[PDB]
Structure formats: structure tokens, C-alpha cells
Homo-oligomer: A and B are copies of this chain.
Amino acid sequence: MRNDGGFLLWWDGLRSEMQPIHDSQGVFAVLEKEVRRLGFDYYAYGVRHTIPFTRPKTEVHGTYPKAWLERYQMQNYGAVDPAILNGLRSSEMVVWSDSLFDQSRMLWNEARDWGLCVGATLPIRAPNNLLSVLSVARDQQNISSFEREEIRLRLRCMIELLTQKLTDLEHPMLMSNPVCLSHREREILQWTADGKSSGEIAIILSISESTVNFHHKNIQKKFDAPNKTLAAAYAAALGLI
């Protein structure tokens, strides 16, 4: 097993260093240490929810200058960003280019203005369906093709362990509308998602129509919703069914 060493040895070492840390700022601090050691100035870990369909909120932490974070949270460049949306298209890492952000150029002009010109971003869909992205950035020295695969594997290991522990530490970042449907309400919401109306679901369950109606009311108030389409869509999105 001590034959290749190398990258596997790095992964074991980073896991050992990461494990006993329990403060989230400590986790980001060690990640910041690691991404400095690869030769990139700055990093940024972002999480795209899918809770609000019309305006999907995207919660982000990282180390870019604070007024640029303010530029995000005021002008709301998160949704218009295609680096985040690349995860929805495919699970490929993507280096940054002027060609890549042809859809939205104001972001690129602001970034190249503001001390970020070279960088890359690795998406990943967390198991709970919250598309997450890990971005890294520097000023000069465009990424070489010789470099790219090592950054790819190391960023994937980093984001895997990172989202694992951020799930473990129940960060504000990933907490959804916390809902815990037990078995029968999970089943009935699932069946409603399958489009069977109340009568069909009732007769196959042989349960009274107004009883299942009241169960729909319980599910309604649980999500604070006016219509079952919200219940079905959100239950599908968050994986409750």
C-alpha cells in the first residue's frame, strides 16, 4: 500500500488534519491554508439552494474582499452567474475565460477590475440536492493544462470532505426548511406527487377521503403553503419523497 504514496498520502493527511477541528471558521481556515499551498490566492465555497424557485438563494462564504461580497448581496449576481449554473449543466470542472462568461459580461468586468482574473470552479451536487461549488482564484499566471488535473482532483477531495463536515456541523448554509415527515405523510405526499387525486389515493389506501384531506392540511401547514403543487414540488426538490 506504500507503493504509490503521493496523492493518497496527501488525502489521508488532510483528513487527519481536518477531522478534530469542530469550529467552522477553523474548517475554512485550514481550507484557506490548503488553497494557498496550491498557489492560488483566494477561494470561495458557495451553495445554491433550490428552495425558492423564482429567485434561488445562493449562500456563500469565502475570502474575497468584503465590498465585493457586498456587490453580490446587493446587485444579486448569484443567479445571473453561469459558473454556478455550470454545475446544473454538467459535473465538469471549468477554468475561467472571457469566452465562458459571454452571457454575463458585467460580472467579468467587475472581477477583472477587482483583483480576480484567473481562476476555476468545481461544482458538485450534495446528496441532499443543494448544488455546491468551490471556486479558487489568483491574479497572474493563467492556469496551465499541465496543472489542471491536480487542481481538479484536489478540489474534488476538498469539496467532498468540506460538504461532509458542513453537513455534520449543521451550518446555516445548508439547513433547508427543516421538515421531518414520518412514514405515512411521506407516502401520501409521494402519492400526491404521482398525480393521483384524493379519491384514487384514498381507495387504494382504503382510507377516508376527509382523513387524507386533513393529512394534506397538516402537510400544507408544515411547509406553510397555499396549494399542493408547492408541497409536491418542494418535496421532490428536497428529497423528502
- Cβ contact within 8 Å between B11 and A153: yes
Min CB distance A151 to B, Å, is 10
Taking the closest CB of chain B, its distance from the CB of A234, in whole angstroms, is: 7
Question: Can you name the residue of chain B whose Cβ is closest to the Cβ of A92?
Answer: B164
- Inter-subunit contact A190/B54 (CB<8 Å): yes
Known A160-B91, A233-B232, A241-B53: A226·B125 in contact at CB below 8 Å: no
Q: Which residue of chain B is the closest to A237 with respect to CB atoms? A: B236
Q: How many copies does the complex hold?
A: 2
Chain B nearest Cβ from A238, distance in angstroms: 9
Across the interface, do A157 and B153 meet the contact criterion of CB distance under 8 Å?
yes
B233, A149: Cβ atoms closer than 8 Å: no
List A residues at the B interface (Cβ < 8 Å): 1, 4-8, 11-12, 15, 50, 52-54, 87-92, 123-129, 146-147, 149-150, 153, 156-157, 160, 163-164, 167, 190-197, 225-237, 239, 241
| Other A-B pairs, 9, CB within 8 Å; known A1-B146, A54-B190, A232-B236 | A4-B6, A11-B149, A15-B149, A90-B127, A90-B164, A91-B160, A125-B125, A195-B231, A232-B232
